Design an enzyme around this catalytic site. Structure first.
Site, PDB file in Angstrom:
ATOM      1  N   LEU A  93      18.162  68.646 116.808  1.00 19.83           N
ATOM      2  CA  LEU A  93      18.744  68.747 118.147  1.00 19.83           C
ATOM      3  C   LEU A  93      20.010  69.596 118.194  1.00 19.83           C
ATOM      4  O   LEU A  93      20.135  70.455 119.061  1.00 19.83           O
ATOM      5  CB  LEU A  93      19.038  67.346 118.710  1.00 19.83           C
ATOM      6  CG  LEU A  93      17.891  66.333 118.722  1.00 19.83           C
ATOM      7  CD1 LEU A  93      18.380  64.920 118.968  1.00 19.83           C
ATOM      8  CD2 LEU A  93      16.834  66.690 119.730  1.00 19.83           C
ATOM      9  N   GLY A  94      20.971  69.384 117.292  1.00 20.00           N
ATOM     10  CA  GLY A  94      22.192  70.162 117.297  1.00 20.00           C
ATOM     11  C   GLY A  94      22.659  70.506 115.893  1.00 20.00           C
ATOM     12  O   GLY A  94      22.082  70.065 114.890  1.00 20.00           O
ATOM     13  N   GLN A  95      23.727  71.311 115.843  1.00 20.38           N
ATOM     14  CA  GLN A  95      24.379  71.729 114.596  1.00 20.38           C
ATOM     15  C   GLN A  95      25.902  71.646 114.712  1.00 20.38           C
ATOM     16  O   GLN A  95      26.462  71.686 115.811  1.00 20.38           O
ATOM     17  CB  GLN A  95      23.976  73.152 114.219  1.00 20.38           C
ATOM     18  N   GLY A 155      26.410  69.232 109.624  1.00 24.58           N
ATOM     19  CA  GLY A 155      26.753  68.572 110.876  1.00 24.58           C
ATOM     20  C   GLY A 155      25.656  68.577 111.926  1.00 24.58           C
ATOM     21  O   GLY A 155      25.924  68.720 113.118  1.00 24.58           O
ATOM     22  N   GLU A 156      24.414  68.413 111.478  1.00 24.46           N
ATOM     23  CA  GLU A 156      23.265  68.407 112.367  1.00 24.46           C
ATOM     24  C   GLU A 156      23.090  67.036 113.018  1.00 24.46           C
ATOM     25  O   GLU A 156      23.738  66.050 112.651  1.00 24.46           O
ATOM     26  CB  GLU A 156      22.001  68.788 111.598  1.00 24.46           C
ATOM     27  CG  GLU A 156      22.277  69.624 110.358  1.00 24.46           C
ATOM     28  CD  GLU A 156      21.004  70.179 109.765  1.00 24.46           C
ATOM     29  OE1 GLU A 156      19.989  69.445 109.760  1.00 24.46           O
ATOM     30  OE2 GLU A 156      21.015  71.345 109.309  1.00 24.46           O
ATOM     31  N   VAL A 157      22.195  66.982 113.997  1.00 24.75           N
ATOM     32  CA  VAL A 157      21.734  65.701 114.526  1.00 24.75           C
ATOM     33  C   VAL A 157      20.272  65.841 114.909  1.00 24.75           C
ATOM     34  O   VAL A 157      19.892  66.782 115.607  1.00 24.75           O
ATOM     35  CB  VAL A 157      22.556  65.204 115.730  1.00 24.75           C
ATOM     36  CG1 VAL A 157      22.814  66.328 116.689  1.00 24.75           C
ATOM     37  CG2 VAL A 157      21.768  64.157 116.432  1.00 24.75           C
ATOM     38  N   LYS A 198      22.252  61.610 112.744  1.00 29.29           N
ATOM     39  CA  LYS A 198      23.259  62.647 112.586  1.00 29.29           C
ATOM     40  C   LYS A 198      23.496  62.878 111.099  1.00 29.29           C
ATOM     41  O   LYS A 198      23.763  61.932 110.355  1.00 29.29           O
ATOM     42  CB  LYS A 198      24.562  62.264 113.287  1.00 29.29           C
ATOM     43  CG  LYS A 198      25.609  63.361 113.267  1.00 29.29           C
ATOM     44  CD  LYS A 198      26.984  62.819 112.967  1.00 29.29           C
ATOM     45  CE  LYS A 198      28.052  63.706 113.566  1.00 29.29           C
ATOM     46  NZ  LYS A 198      29.403  63.231 113.160  1.00 29.29           N
ATOM     47  N   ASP A 201      38.910  62.473 123.354  1.00 27.65           N
ATOM     48  CA  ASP A 201      38.029  63.611 123.629  1.00 27.65           C
ATOM     49  C   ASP A 201      36.918  63.057 124.519  1.00 27.65           C
ATOM     50  O   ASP A 201      35.788  62.832 124.103  1.00 27.65           O
ATOM     51  CB  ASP A 201      37.468  64.272 122.366  1.00 27.65           C
ATOM     52  CG  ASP A 201      36.912  65.705 122.621  1.00 27.65           C
ATOM     53  OD1 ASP A 201      37.256  66.375 123.626  1.00 27.65           O
ATOM     54  OD2 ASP A 201      36.085  66.165 121.805  1.00 27.65           O
TER      55      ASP A 201
END
Ligand SMILES: C=CC(=O)N1CC[C@H](n2nc(C#Cc3cc(OC)cc(OC)c3)c3c(N)ncnc32)C1
Length: 247
Positions: A16-18, A19-21, A35, A118
């Protein structure tokens, strides 16, 4: 240590994202978000904080390669959700309901004497049925000036950021302070400037944002107040609300 899970119990299916998930399966039974930490460096916080609108930790694996297992949020980030194909259909009642859920979660953070530091749409996850959960993953445009200038990161400064997140909700994901560079924002927020009322957004809601953006941290409202205000928005504050083209 009770959170520890065997490495064979995780299947990493879709990145899904990028430390990836990743999106994956835990115990071949449960939809989960995984993650990945690449072999930098933890989440003693996530093992304590349990709340309806905080996305829950499920399990962990502690030795490198480390894997964090949390519940799955089908719609991804709130920033993606607002910008994507669903944005066209969201109206103020939907957006105000999400903002109340975030305030609700943040009010739990408020009761626990924690700070987020944050808070913004990028760190809100969305699930089925418009469920939104606050998530903890150079944000001058979202940071309260006293926190950005002097490092006073209070729940008060998180409130300021909630105020900014309300602007992301009412513009459907547009970056706050359009056309202003980071240094231009710091200088003008101290001179007293604040974002105007977003198009089609009631003045009652913009006023709420301004309470969040008070220069004096102790004068901005609590999350308990914000949650309550947004939960009755359409009875106590805008009983006359009529749908529009975008809000
Ligand atoms: C950098 C990636 C990013 O922002 N996203 C948003 C969507 C995607 N993502 N990212 C997710 C996540 C996460 C996450 C992972 C964590 O490990 C510490 C901690 C945390 O605090 C809540 C959140 C996630 C999820 N749980 N369910 C569905 N999608 C998820 C990737």
């Amino acid at each position: 240590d009770a959170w520890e899970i065997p490495r064979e119990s995780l299947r990493l299916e879709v990145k899904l994202g990028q430390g990836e998930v990743w999106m994956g399966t835990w115990n071949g039974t449960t939809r989960v978000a995984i993650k990945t930490l690449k072999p930098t460096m933890e989440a003693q916080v996530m093992k304590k904080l349990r709340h309806e609108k905080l996305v829950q930790l499920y399990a962990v694996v502690s030795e490198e390669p480390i894997y964090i297992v949390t519940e799955y949020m089908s719609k991804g980030s709130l920033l993606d959700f607002l910008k994507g194909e669903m944005g066209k259909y969201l109206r103020l009642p939907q957006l105000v309901d999400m903002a109340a859920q975030i305030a609700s979660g943040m009010a739990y953070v408020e009761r626990m004497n924690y700070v987020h530091r944050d808070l913004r749409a990028a760190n809100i996850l969305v699930g089925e049925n418009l469920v939104c959960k606050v998530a903890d993953f150079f944000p001058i445009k979202w940071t309260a000036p006293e926190a950005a200038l002097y490092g006073r990161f209070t729940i008060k400064s998180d409130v300021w950021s909630f105020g900014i997140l309300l602007t992301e909700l009412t513009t459907k994901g547009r970056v706050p302070y359009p056309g202003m560079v980071n240094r231009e924002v710091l200088d003008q927020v101290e001179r007293g400037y604040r974002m105007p009322c977003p198009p089609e957004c009631p003045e009652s809601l913009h006023d709420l944002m301004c309470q969040c953006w008070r220069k004096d941290p102790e004068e901005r409202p609590t999350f308990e107040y914000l949650q309550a205000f947004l939960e009755d928005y359409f009875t106590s504050t805008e009983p006359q609300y009529q749908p529009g083209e975008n809000l």
